[PDB]
Design a protein around this ligand. Sequence first.
Ligand SMILES: *[C@@H]1O[C@H](CO)[C@@H](O[C@@H]2O[C@H](CO)[C@@H](O)[C@H](O)[C@H]2NC(C)=O)[C@H](O)[C@H]1NC(C)=O
Ligand SMILES: *[C@@H]1O[C@H](CO)[C@@H](O[C@@H]2O[C@H](CO)[C@@H](O)[C@H](O)[C@H]2NC(C)=O)[C@H](O)[C@H]1NC(C)=O
Ligand SMILES: *[C@@H]1O[C@H](CO)[C@@H](O[C@@H]2O[C@H](CO)[C@@H](O)[C@H](O)[C@H]2NC(C)=O)[C@H](O)[C@H]1NC(C)=O
Ligand SMILES: [Ca+2]
Ligand SMILES: [Ca+2]
Length: 339
Amino acid sequence: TCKITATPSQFQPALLNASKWIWTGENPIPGGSNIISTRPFRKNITAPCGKCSVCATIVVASDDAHTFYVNGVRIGTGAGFRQGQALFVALQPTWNLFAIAGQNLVANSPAGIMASILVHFSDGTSETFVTDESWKTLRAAPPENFQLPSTNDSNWPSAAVQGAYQNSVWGPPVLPPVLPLRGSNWIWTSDNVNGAAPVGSRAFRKTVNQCTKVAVCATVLIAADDRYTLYVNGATVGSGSSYTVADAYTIPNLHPTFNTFAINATNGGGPAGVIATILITYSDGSNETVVTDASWKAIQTIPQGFQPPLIDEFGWESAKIIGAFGVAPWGAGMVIPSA
Ligand SMILES: *[C@@H]1O[C@H](CO)[C@@H](O[C@@H]2O[C@H](CO)[C@@H](O)[C@H](O)[C@H]2NC(C)=O)[C@H](O)[C@H]1NC(C)=O
Ligand SMILES: *[C@@H]1O[C@H](CO)[C@@H](O[C@@H]2O[C@H](CO)[C@@H](O)[C@H](O)[C@H]2NC(C)=O)[C@H](O)[C@H]1NC(C)=O
Ligand SMILES: *[C@@H]1O[C@H](CO)[C@@H](O[C@@H]2O[C@H](CO)[C@@H](O)[C@H](O)[C@H]2NC(C)=O)[C@H](O)[C@H]1NC(C)=O
Ligand SMILES: [Ca+2]
Ligand SMILES: [Ca+2]
Protein backbone atom coordinates (compact mmCIF):
# COMPACT_ATOMS: atom_id res chain seq x y z
CA THR A 1 0.00 0.00 0.00
CA CYS A 2 3.10 2.41 0.01
CA LYS A 3 5.43 3.38 -2.73
CA ILE A 4 8.83 1.85 -2.09
CA THR A 5 11.36 4.66 -2.50
CA ALA A 6 14.15 2.72 -0.73
CA THR A 7 16.89 1.83 -3.16
CA PRO A 8 19.78 -0.75 -3.05
CA SER A 9 22.37 -0.03 -0.36
CA GLN A 10 25.14 -1.59 1.67
CA PHE A 11 23.75 -4.27 4.00
CA GLN A 12 22.96 -2.98 7.52
CA PRO A 13 23.59 -5.64 10.24
CA ALA A 14 20.92 -6.30 12.84
CA LEU A 15 22.70 -6.17 16.21
CA LEU A 16 21.97 -7.84 19.55
CA ASN A 17 23.33 -5.00 21.80
CA ALA A 18 19.88 -3.61 22.84
CA SER A 19 18.27 -6.98 23.01
CA LYS A 20 17.18 -8.97 26.14
CA TRP A 21 16.97 -12.64 27.02
CA ILE A 22 13.43 -13.74 27.95
CA TRP A 23 11.69 -16.71 29.55
CA THR A 24 8.58 -17.21 31.69
CA GLY A 25 9.64 -16.30 35.22
CA GLU A 26 8.60 -19.66 36.54
CA ASN A 27 11.86 -19.28 38.34
CA PRO A 28 11.88 -15.60 39.54
CA ILE A 29 15.71 -15.69 39.57
CA PRO A 30 16.88 -14.57 36.16
CA GLY A 31 19.45 -16.90 34.68
CA GLY A 32 18.25 -19.37 37.27
CA SER A 33 17.52 -23.11 36.98
CA ASN A 34 14.44 -24.08 34.96
CA ILE A 35 12.66 -27.35 34.17
CA ILE A 36 12.70 -29.11 30.79
CA SER A 37 9.87 -27.44 28.97
CA THR A 38 8.62 -25.69 25.88
CA ARG A 39 7.18 -22.18 26.16
CA PRO A 40 5.59 -19.65 23.82
CA PHE A 41 6.52 -16.04 23.20
CA ARG A 42 4.63 -13.53 21.02
CA LYS A 43 4.78 -9.94 20.06
CA ASN A 44 2.65 -7.93 17.73
CA ILE A 45 4.64 -5.15 16.21
CA THR A 46 3.08 -2.27 14.30
CA ALA A 47 4.67 0.02 11.74
CA PRO A 48 5.02 3.65 12.88
CA CYS A 49 3.57 6.83 11.38
CA GLY A 50 2.87 6.75 7.59
CA LYS A 51 5.53 4.07 7.04
CA CYS A 52 4.99 0.58 5.51
CA SER A 53 7.13 -2.25 6.63
CA VAL A 54 8.63 -4.31 3.76
CA CYS A 55 11.02 -6.91 5.21
CA ALA A 56 13.25 -7.81 8.20
CA THR A 57 16.67 -9.19 9.12
CA ILE A 58 16.35 -11.31 12.26
CA VAL A 59 19.07 -12.54 14.61
CA VAL A 60 17.96 -15.12 17.20
CA ALA A 61 19.80 -17.19 19.91
CA SER A 62 18.42 -19.57 22.45
CA ASP A 63 19.08 -21.65 25.46
CA ASP A 64 18.48 -24.35 24.30
CA ALA A 65 16.40 -24.26 21.11
CA HIS A 66 13.81 -22.32 19.22
CA THR A 67 11.36 -22.20 16.40
CA PHE A 68 10.62 -18.84 14.85
CA TYR A 69 7.29 -17.82 13.23
CA VAL A 70 6.19 -14.72 11.41
CA ASN A 71 2.38 -14.12 10.79
CA GLY A 72 1.81 -17.81 11.35
CA VAL A 73 4.59 -19.14 9.10
CA ARG A 74 7.64 -21.09 10.31
CA ILE A 75 10.75 -19.16 9.09
CA GLY A 76 13.38 -21.22 11.00
CA THR A 77 14.56 -23.56 13.62
CA GLY A 78 17.78 -23.22 15.67
CA ALA A 79 19.63 -23.68 18.89
CA GLY A 80 22.40 -22.41 21.10
CA PHE A 81 23.40 -19.14 22.82
CA ARG A 82 26.96 -18.74 21.71
CA GLN A 83 26.11 -17.74 18.22
CA GLY A 84 23.00 -16.17 16.71
CA GLN A 85 21.12 -17.47 13.72
CA ALA A 86 20.25 -15.16 10.73
CA LEU A 87 16.76 -15.28 9.24
CA PHE A 88 15.19 -13.06 6.49
CA VAL A 89 11.46 -12.57 6.04
CA ALA A 90 9.00 -10.46 4.03
CA LEU A 91 6.49 -8.57 6.17
CA GLN A 92 2.87 -7.30 6.11
CA PRO A 93 2.78 -3.53 5.72
CA THR A 94 1.27 -2.32 9.02
CA TRP A 95 1.50 -5.03 11.60
CA ASN A 96 3.44 -8.30 12.05
CA LEU A 97 3.01 -11.00 14.58
CA PHE A 98 6.36 -12.57 15.70
CA ALA A 99 6.17 -15.77 17.65
CA ILE A 100 8.79 -18.04 19.05
CA ALA A 101 8.59 -21.42 20.69
CA GLY A 102 11.60 -21.88 23.02
CA GLN A 103 12.73 -25.06 24.67
CA ASN A 104 14.75 -25.78 27.66
CA LEU A 105 16.32 -29.23 27.10
CA VAL A 106 18.48 -29.69 30.21
CA ALA A 107 17.07 -30.05 33.71
CA ASN A 108 17.97 -27.43 36.31
CA SER A 109 19.63 -25.26 33.67
CA PRO A 110 18.96 -21.70 32.57
CA ALA A 111 16.50 -20.94 29.83
CA GLY A 112 16.05 -18.07 27.46
CA ILE A 113 15.46 -16.60 24.03
CA MET A 114 17.01 -13.49 22.57
CA ALA A 115 16.27 -11.81 19.27
CA SER A 116 16.70 -8.70 17.24
CA ILE A 117 14.37 -7.77 14.37
CA LEU A 118 15.64 -5.11 12.06
CA VAL A 119 12.57 -3.90 10.07
CA HIS A 120 13.17 -2.10 6.77
CA PHE A 121 10.44 0.43 5.87
CA SER A 122 9.15 1.65 2.39
CA ASP A 123 10.89 4.95 2.70
CA GLY A 124 14.36 3.57 3.24
CA THR A 125 14.51 3.81 7.02
CA SER A 126 14.88 1.00 9.59
CA GLU A 127 14.16 0.26 13.16
CA THR A 128 15.25 -2.56 15.54
CA PHE A 129 12.79 -4.38 17.70
CA VAL A 130 13.90 -6.77 20.41
CA THR A 131 12.83 -9.45 22.76
CA ASP A 132 11.89 -7.88 26.15
CA GLU A 133 9.29 -7.67 28.86
CA SER A 134 6.65 -6.34 26.36
CA TRP A 135 6.46 -9.83 24.69
CA LYS A 136 3.73 -12.23 25.93
CA THR A 137 4.19 -15.75 27.18
CA LEU A 138 2.53 -18.55 29.17
CA ARG A 139 3.72 -20.69 32.09
CA ALA A 140 2.65 -23.74 30.10
CA ALA A 141 3.33 -25.61 26.87
CA PRO A 142 2.31 -23.67 23.79
CA PRO A 143 -1.41 -24.12 22.80
CA GLU A 144 -2.33 -25.50 19.39
CA ASN A 145 -1.80 -22.62 16.99
CA PHE A 146 -0.16 -20.16 19.48
CA GLN A 147 1.72 -18.72 16.54
CA LEU A 148 -1.27 -17.75 14.40
CA PRO A 149 -2.64 -14.22 14.45
CA SER A 150 -6.08 -15.54 15.13
CA THR A 151 -5.00 -16.71 18.70
CA ASN A 152 -5.98 -13.97 21.31
CA ASP A 153 -2.93 -13.33 23.61
CA SER A 154 -4.75 -10.65 25.72
CA ASN A 155 -4.65 -12.56 29.02
CA TRP A 156 -1.17 -13.92 28.50
CA PRO A 157 1.44 -12.71 31.11
CA SER A 158 4.36 -10.59 30.21
CA ALA A 159 7.69 -12.33 29.52
CA ALA A 160 10.34 -12.18 32.23
CA VAL A 161 13.76 -10.74 31.43
CA GLN A 162 16.65 -13.17 32.09
CA GLY A 163 19.51 -10.99 31.22
CA ALA A 164 20.84 -8.38 28.81
CA TYR A 165 23.37 -8.50 26.04
CA GLN A 166 26.37 -7.61 28.24
CA ASN A 167 24.98 -8.66 31.58
CA SER A 168 23.66 -12.27 31.64
CA VAL A 169 24.67 -15.82 32.38
CA TRP A 170 25.20 -16.38 28.65
CA GLY A 171 27.51 -13.59 27.70
CA PRO A 172 27.14 -11.82 24.33
CA PRO A 173 26.24 -14.07 21.39
CA VAL A 174 28.52 -13.79 18.34
CA LEU A 175 26.69 -12.54 15.22
CA PRO A 176 26.65 -15.08 12.34
CA PRO A 177 27.73 -14.15 8.88
CA VAL A 178 24.95 -12.35 6.82
CA LEU A 179 24.88 -15.29 4.44
CA PRO A 180 27.09 -18.38 4.01
CA LEU A 181 29.70 -18.76 1.18
CA ARG A 182 29.90 -22.43 2.05
CA GLY A 183 27.45 -23.82 -0.53
CA SER A 184 28.61 -21.40 -3.35
CA ASN A 185 31.26 -21.76 -6.02
CA TRP A 186 33.94 -19.63 -7.45
CA ILE A 187 32.98 -19.26 -11.11
CA TRP A 188 34.42 -17.90 -14.21
CA THR A 189 34.45 -18.07 -17.94
CA SER A 190 35.92 -21.24 -19.59
CA ASP A 191 39.01 -19.37 -20.16
CA ASN A 192 40.24 -20.12 -16.57
CA VAL A 193 42.31 -23.33 -17.06
CA ASN A 194 45.41 -24.14 -14.96
CA GLY A 195 44.95 -21.98 -11.96
CA ALA A 196 44.54 -19.54 -15.02
CA ALA A 197 43.07 -16.98 -16.42
CA PRO A 198 43.56 -14.17 -18.97
CA VAL A 199 43.55 -10.51 -18.15
CA GLY A 200 40.04 -9.39 -19.32
CA SER A 201 36.60 -8.40 -17.98
CA ARG A 202 33.93 -11.07 -18.04
CA ALA A 203 30.25 -10.93 -17.43
CA PHE A 204 27.88 -13.26 -15.64
CA ARG A 205 24.06 -13.37 -15.46
CA LYS A 206 21.49 -15.06 -13.40
CA THR A 207 17.69 -14.67 -13.60
CA VAL A 208 15.19 -15.64 -10.98
CA ASN A 209 11.53 -15.83 -12.03
CA GLN A 210 8.93 -17.56 -9.95
CA CYS A 211 5.81 -16.21 -11.75
CA THR A 212 3.38 -17.61 -9.13
CA LYS A 213 4.95 -15.74 -6.10
CA VAL A 214 5.71 -12.24 -5.10
CA ALA A 215 9.37 -11.50 -4.46
CA VAL A 216 10.06 -8.71 -1.93
CA CYS A 217 13.77 -8.19 -0.90
CA ALA A 218 17.07 -9.70 -1.83
CA THR A 219 20.38 -9.79 0.02
CA VAL A 220 23.52 -10.33 -1.90
CA LEU A 221 26.94 -11.40 -0.67
CA ILE A 222 29.72 -11.23 -3.18
CA ALA A 223 33.45 -11.12 -3.83
CA ALA A 224 35.74 -11.46 -6.74
CA ASP A 225 39.30 -11.91 -7.75
CA ASP A 226 40.19 -9.09 -8.68
CA ARG A 227 37.30 -6.65 -8.61
CA TYR A 228 33.48 -6.68 -9.70
CA THR A 229 30.59 -4.45 -10.40
CA LEU A 230 27.14 -5.75 -9.60
CA TYR A 231 23.76 -4.84 -11.27
CA VAL A 232 20.23 -5.87 -10.42
CA ASN A 233 17.45 -5.36 -13.06
CA GLY A 234 19.91 -3.11 -14.93
CA ALA A 235 20.65 -0.65 -12.06
CA THR A 236 24.16 -0.38 -10.47
CA VAL A 237 24.16 -1.85 -6.93
CA GLY A 238 27.84 -1.56 -6.02
CA SER A 239 31.36 -2.70 -6.63
CA GLY A 240 34.41 -4.08 -4.88
CA SER A 241 38.02 -5.00 -5.36
CA SER A 242 38.83 -7.58 -2.67
CA TYR A 243 38.92 -11.29 -2.78
CA THR A 244 39.54 -11.51 1.01
CA VAL A 245 36.73 -9.17 2.32
CA ALA A 246 33.29 -9.76 0.85
CA ASP A 247 30.57 -7.09 0.33
CA ALA A 248 26.94 -7.52 1.19
CA TYR A 249 24.01 -5.55 -0.32
CA THR A 250 20.31 -5.15 0.34
CA ILE A 251 17.84 -4.75 -2.54
CA PRO A 252 14.60 -3.66 -0.98
CA ASN A 253 12.70 -2.73 -4.27
CA LEU A 254 12.70 -6.01 -6.15
CA HIS A 255 10.35 -6.64 -9.10
CA PRO A 256 7.57 -9.04 -7.99
CA THR A 257 8.28 -11.86 -10.38
CA PHE A 258 11.33 -11.41 -12.49
CA ASN A 259 14.74 -10.26 -11.38
CA THR A 260 18.08 -10.33 -13.03
CA PHE A 261 21.53 -10.20 -11.33
CA ALA A 262 24.46 -9.37 -13.45
CA ILE A 263 28.19 -8.96 -12.75
CA ASN A 264 31.08 -7.51 -14.67
CA ALA A 265 34.17 -9.05 -13.00
CA THR A 266 37.69 -8.22 -13.97
CA ASN A 267 40.93 -10.25 -13.75
CA GLY A 268 44.04 -8.05 -13.27
CA GLY A 269 46.19 -11.16 -13.81
CA GLY A 270 46.66 -14.55 -12.22
CA PRO A 271 43.85 -16.81 -10.85
CA ALA A 272 40.38 -15.37 -11.16
CA GLY A 273 36.88 -15.98 -9.90
CA VAL A 274 33.62 -14.54 -8.72
CA ILE A 275 31.56 -15.92 -5.91
CA ALA A 276 28.15 -14.94 -4.57
CA THR A 277 25.19 -16.01 -2.47
CA ILE A 278 21.76 -14.43 -2.90
CA LEU A 279 18.72 -14.81 -0.72
CA ILE A 280 15.32 -13.66 -1.98
CA THR A 281 12.33 -13.33 0.31
CA TYR A 282 8.70 -13.93 -0.82
CA SER A 283 5.39 -12.48 0.55
CA ASP A 284 4.18 -15.84 1.68
CA GLY A 285 7.14 -16.13 4.13
CA SER A 286 9.22 -18.51 2.05
CA ASN A 287 12.59 -17.65 0.60
CA GLU A 288 15.09 -18.92 -1.87
CA THR A 289 18.83 -19.08 -2.19
CA VAL A 290 20.78 -18.83 -5.36
CA VAL A 291 24.52 -19.33 -5.55
CA THR A 292 27.22 -18.88 -8.16
CA ASP A 293 27.31 -22.13 -10.05
CA ALA A 294 27.03 -23.59 -13.61
CA SER A 295 23.37 -22.32 -14.05
CA TRP A 296 24.82 -18.91 -14.42
CA LYS A 297 25.62 -17.70 -17.91
CA ALA A 298 28.91 -16.09 -18.75
CA ILE A 299 30.64 -14.41 -21.65
CA GLN A 300 34.26 -13.56 -22.59
CA THR A 301 33.65 -10.35 -24.50
CA ILE A 302 31.12 -8.28 -22.75
CA PRO A 303 28.36 -6.89 -25.06
CA GLN A 304 26.70 -3.42 -24.68
CA GLY A 305 23.67 -3.85 -22.45
CA PHE A 306 25.04 -7.12 -20.76
CA GLN A 307 23.29 -5.85 -17.65
CA PRO A 308 19.64 -5.41 -18.94
CA PRO A 309 17.10 -7.79 -17.77
CA LEU A 310 15.79 -8.98 -21.09
CA ILE A 311 18.73 -9.41 -23.51
CA ASP A 312 19.30 -12.32 -25.83
CA GLU A 313 21.71 -14.79 -24.19
CA PHE A 314 22.66 -16.53 -27.43
CA GLY A 315 26.47 -17.06 -27.34
CA TRP A 316 26.74 -16.83 -23.55
CA GLU A 317 28.11 -20.12 -22.08
CA SER A 318 27.37 -21.95 -18.84
CA ALA A 319 29.74 -20.50 -16.26
CA LYS A 320 32.65 -22.73 -15.28
CA ILE A 321 32.96 -23.92 -11.66
CA ILE A 322 36.54 -23.17 -10.63
CA GLY A 323 35.81 -24.83 -7.25
CA ALA A 324 33.51 -24.79 -4.18
CA PHE A 325 34.06 -22.12 -1.60
CA GLY A 326 37.22 -23.17 0.34
CA VAL A 327 39.45 -24.17 -2.52
CA ALA A 328 43.00 -22.82 -2.97
CA PRO A 329 44.12 -20.29 -3.71
CA TRP A 330 41.60 -18.19 -1.86
CA GLY A 331 40.83 -20.60 1.00
CA ALA A 332 38.06 -20.40 3.62
CA GLY A 333 39.04 -17.20 5.42
CA MET A 334 36.89 -14.61 3.62
CA VAL A 335 35.72 -11.90 5.99
CA ILE A 336 31.94 -11.84 5.67
CA PRO A 337 29.83 -9.00 7.17
CA SER A 338 27.72 -9.88 10.23
CA ALA A 339 23.91 -10.47 9.94
C1 LIG B 1 14.05 -20.11 4.24
O1 LIG B 1 12.83 -20.84 4.59
C2 LIG B 1 12.88 -22.21 5.15
C3 LIG B 1 11.47 -22.62 5.70
O2 LIG B 1 10.40 -21.97 5.05
C4 LIG B 1 13.90 -22.43 6.32
O3 LIG B 1 14.57 -23.75 6.37
C5 LIG B 1 14.01 -25.07 6.02
O4 LIG B 1 13.67 -25.32 7.39
C6 LIG B 1 14.78 -25.39 8.36
C7 LIG B 1 14.85 -24.25 9.44
O5 LIG B 1 16.11 -23.53 9.60
C8 LIG B 1 16.14 -25.68 7.68
O6 LIG B 1 16.86 -26.56 8.56
C9 LIG B 1 16.11 -26.45 6.37
O7 LIG B 1 17.37 -26.26 5.69
C10 LIG B 1 14.99 -26.18 5.35
N1 LIG B 1 14.67 -27.61 4.93
C11 LIG B 1 15.51 -28.81 4.73
C12 LIG B 1 17.04 -29.10 4.81
O8 LIG B 1 15.06 -29.89 4.41
C13 LIG B 1 14.96 -21.28 6.31
O9 LIG B 1 15.20 -20.99 7.65
C14 LIG B 1 14.62 -19.92 5.63
N2 LIG B 1 15.80 -19.08 5.60
C15 LIG B 1 15.91 -17.83 6.10
C16 LIG B 1 14.72 -17.28 6.63
O10 LIG B 1 16.94 -17.16 6.12
C1 LIG C 1 -1.63 -6.12 15.87
O1 LIG C 1 -1.97 -4.76 16.11
C2 LIG C 1 -2.80 -4.09 15.11
C3 LIG C 1 -2.81 -2.59 15.40
O2 LIG C 1 -3.18 -2.44 16.76
C4 LIG C 1 -4.18 -4.76 15.00
O3 LIG C 1 -4.97 -4.35 13.83
C5 LIG C 1 -6.09 -3.50 14.13
O4 LIG C 1 -7.25 -4.24 14.53
C6 LIG C 1 -8.37 -3.37 14.82
C7 LIG C 1 -9.38 -4.02 15.77
O5 LIG C 1 -9.17 -5.43 15.77
C8 LIG C 1 -8.95 -2.93 13.47
O6 LIG C 1 -10.22 -2.23 13.57
C9 LIG C 1 -7.84 -2.04 12.85
O7 LIG C 1 -8.24 -1.62 11.53
C10 LIG C 1 -6.39 -2.67 12.89
N1 LIG C 1 -5.40 -1.59 12.88
C11 LIG C 1 -4.41 -1.43 11.97
C12 LIG C 1 -3.51 -0.21 12.16
O8 LIG C 1 -4.20 -2.22 11.05
C13 LIG C 1 -3.82 -6.21 14.72
O9 LIG C 1 -4.99 -6.96 14.60
C14 LIG C 1 -2.90 -6.89 15.75
N2 LIG C 1 -2.64 -8.26 15.35
C15 LIG C 1 -2.78 -9.26 16.21
C16 LIG C 1 -2.49 -10.67 15.76
O10 LIG C 1 -3.03 -9.04 17.39
C1 LIG D 1 33.79 -3.81 -16.72
O1 LIG D 1 34.54 -3.31 -15.60
C2 LIG D 1 35.87 -2.84 -15.92
C3 LIG D 1 36.51 -2.47 -14.58
O2 LIG D 1 35.61 -1.69 -13.80
C4 LIG D 1 35.83 -1.70 -16.96
O3 LIG D 1 37.14 -1.10 -17.27
C5 LIG D 1 37.29 0.28 -16.71
O4 LIG D 1 36.42 1.18 -17.46
C6 LIG D 1 36.65 2.60 -17.53
C7 LIG D 1 35.55 3.19 -18.44
O5 LIG D 1 34.62 4.02 -17.75
C8 LIG D 1 38.08 2.83 -18.07
O6 LIG D 1 38.45 4.24 -18.10
C9 LIG D 1 39.16 2.07 -17.28
O7 LIG D 1 40.18 1.74 -18.21
C10 LIG D 1 38.76 0.78 -16.49
N1 LIG D 1 39.08 1.08 -15.05
C11 LIG D 1 39.77 0.33 -14.17
C12 LIG D 1 39.96 0.88 -12.76
O8 LIG D 1 40.22 -0.77 -14.48
C13 LIG D 1 34.97 -2.19 -18.17
O9 LIG D 1 34.87 -1.13 -19.10
C14 LIG D 1 33.60 -2.51 -17.57
N2 LIG D 1 32.32 -2.34 -18.33
C15 LIG D 1 31.91 -3.05 -19.34
C16 LIG D 1 30.58 -2.68 -19.90
O10 LIG D 1 32.65 -3.91 -19.76
CA1 LIG E 1 18.89 -24.76 29.27
CA1 LIG F 1 43.58 -12.44 -10.42
